[PDB]
Amino acid sequence: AQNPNCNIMIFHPTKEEFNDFDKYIAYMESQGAHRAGLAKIIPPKEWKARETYDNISEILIATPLQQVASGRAGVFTQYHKKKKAMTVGEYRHLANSKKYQTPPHQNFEDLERKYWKNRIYNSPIYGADISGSLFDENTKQWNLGHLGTIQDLLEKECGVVIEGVNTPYLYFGMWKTTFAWHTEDMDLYSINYLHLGEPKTWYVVPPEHGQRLERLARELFPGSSRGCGAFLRHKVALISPTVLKENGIPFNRITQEAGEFMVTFPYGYHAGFNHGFNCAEAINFATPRWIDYGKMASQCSCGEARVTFSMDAFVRILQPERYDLWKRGQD
């Protein structure tokens, strides 16, 4: 078995190997990359996502979210408070202000310590889930706006044509902006490109050990657990690496820098934080190996997790028994 310790693997494809996305994902998995739940892909040196980032300031962040924490430093939840619209230019100015900017630090490890020590005492503002793309339409390789769609993958594997579309999303982050512990909708893959700015640190649990994370989470967030059998779908719970180590949860960590891709694999729980002002683009995708994860994915039916138009069809076809109860939560 390849990668039996489930380490995060880093890949350095050539420009030739960067031509066929599907085939490269399949190559990574042949080397055991999926076992970690997350891989890093450094693009060939000849590759670029677009020519410059000089003209992005007029993108609108219609609903910036202030991330308010409750709990203790190592075990907390966050809620998202809606703020007034601002432009990327305005957001970047806010991210760089004395109130929100990254503090002095020695190295990524010192900054990670400061994050976990201090995150709960601040409320950073996140421009998340903004439909759109920063890839130049003439970038042909690993252009997240030109990937094959999940609906076409389901049609190719299973023979059923379904409604729905699949498009990318932009994330504008600042120091301490946080992504809570989650797997993707319907335990899909995700791919994330860090277009510009400061780094993003990631934590991940190997898919084969996901249930151990879930069990710890039910212990650490007992009222949430009673309210919903899949409450990590709410994307509100954080658990520090210290707390995971104390409870014997296997995980790994890695820092993504501007110009690098990350791929999360089906049922790979992940969480993390941004180091300072940055802009990432991400999209879900599927392969033939996803299908069986899609069939088994947990669902939130308490009604909190409230998800896309396109997830309907996935649940309808892959999880017909759940469909009924899940759509009652969605309506």
Ligand SMILES: O=C(O)CNC(=O)C(=O)O
């Ligand atoms: O970049 C972020 O805030 C979070 N992204 C993801 O969880 C992802 O790409 O799967």
Ligand SMILES: [Mg+2]
């Ligand atoms: Mg602009």
Ligand code: NI
């Ligand atoms: Ni994710």
Ligand SMILES: [Zn+2]
């Ligand atoms: Zn729920």
